Symmetry: C2
Amino acid sequence: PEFTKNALNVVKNDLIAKVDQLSGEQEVLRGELEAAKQAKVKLENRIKELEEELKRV
Amino acid sequence: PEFTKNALNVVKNDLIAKVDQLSGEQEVLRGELEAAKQAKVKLENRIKELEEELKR
């Protein structure tokens, strides 16, 4: 009864902590993913600039 | 002239190489995101089951 409730709360809170840890990892990864996406746009625009410059000899 | 063309291509090819590396990083990152998302879903279902058991 008291032991059971206690035990259930202990494991429940363990799992909640694991979820929060994953959420933290997610936020970091999403940040890296956004940074990569923006950096790629810049590079691709620069490649188009260089292709124009090559055309102009 | 030809020296100019070669020089610009060095820069162009380097940028292309960098784009490819970022494409690789994006794919790895997306794979890790999906794994995390799926892991979270499983944890949340386990938490829900425990919450329902606590109600009893």
